[PDB]
């Protein structure tokens, strides 16, 4: 918006406003991945850390 400028009375004149604006946009996204595995060699004969036998 903008301020109106005074104009003469007998001489009919006027003022008008400008139109509006529009745009558009886009977004990508991020991807994450993780992998893990279990093997029998991790269990065979391994003592429990907190206890004996």
């Amino acid at each position: 918006v903008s301020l109106l400028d005074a104009v003469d009375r007998d001489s009919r004149k006027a003022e008008t406003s400008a139109p509006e604006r529009v745009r558009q946009i886009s977004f990508p996204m991020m991807y994450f991945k993780e992998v893990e595995s279990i093997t029998p060699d991790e269990i065979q004969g391994v003592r429990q850390p907190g206890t004996a036998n």
Binding site: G45, V46, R47, P49, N53
Partner: protein
């Protein structure tokens, strides 16, 4: 029955009992009962012999 492995503090191994050896003791003559006990109160004892023809 498990115990610590031969070369690691974190691994377990089993213990299969025990094997024992005992020396031989014959004791054959003692079982015949040939000898008769004869306790005495002193440190030496005497005996008498006799005969005729």
């Amino acid at each position: 029955m498990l115990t610590n492995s031969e070369k690691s503090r974190f691994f377990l191994a089993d213990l299969t009992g025990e094997v024992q050896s005992i020396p031989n003791t014959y004791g054959y003559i003692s079982n015949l009962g040939l000898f008769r006990s004869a306790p005495i109160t002193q440190t030496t004892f005497l005996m008498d012999l006799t005969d005729w023809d």
